[PDB]
Each structure stands twice: as C-alpha cells, then as structure tokens.
Amino acid sequence: HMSSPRAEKARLYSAIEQRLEQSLQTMEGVLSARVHISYVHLSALAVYERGSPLAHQISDIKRFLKNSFADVDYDNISVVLSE
Structure with missing residues (x-):
C-alpha cells in the first residue's frame, strides 16, 4: 500500500506540483x-x-x-486564470 509504486508516484507528482506552484507565484501579476x-x-x-x-x-x-x-x-x- 503506502510504499507501493502507485503511492510513491503520487508523492513524487505532488512534490513537482509544489515546485511548479512555488515558481508560478514568482511571476509578475500571478498572486x-x-x-x-x-x-x-x-x-x-x-x-x-x-x-x-x-x-x-x-x-x-x-x-x-x-x-x-x-x-x-x-x-x-x-x-485557467482568475481576477
């Protein structure tokens, strides 16, 4: 279960997302x-x-x-962009 390829694939994709969000928030206008x-x-x-x-x-x-x-x-x- 928790240490299986399926659950590790989720954690790794989650880690990428958090870097991509951290970086998108560095862009001018992106709050x-x-x-x-x-x-x-x-x-x-x-x-x-x-x-x-x-x-x-x-x-x-x-x-x-x-x-x-x-x-x-x-x-x-x-x-998708918001106000």
Whole structure:
C-alpha cells in the first residue's frame, strides 16, 4: 500500500506540483497558483493581474510549465486564470 509504486508516484507528482506552484507565484501579476498533475495532463489555476493580454499570459505560463516539467505534452497543459 503506502510504499507501493502507485503511492510513491503520487508523492513524487505532488512534490513537482509544489515546485511548479512555488515558481508560478514568482511571476509578475500571478498572486496565487494551484497545480494538479493528472496521470499525462497538467492543470494550473492562477489568480493573475491582467497586466498583459489573457492569450499572451496563458502562453507564457504554458511555456514556463513545459520548460519546468518537460514530461508533459504542451497540448495536454491547461491554464485557467482568475481576477
């Protein structure tokens, strides 16, 4: 159970998420961020201050997340931005 490949895969994906959230929160305008890795898709929900067009910001986060977690396919990354 707790030390099995399934449970260790979750812990490791959780550790990556927490680094990706810690880093998304370093971006100008991004106040808070939440990253979920579905196993392979990635989901990001960040509260952004619209200092740039939405399309541009989504593109910036998507490129950053790919460069920081190269295991996910670009098209399988999802960014939803809040106020």
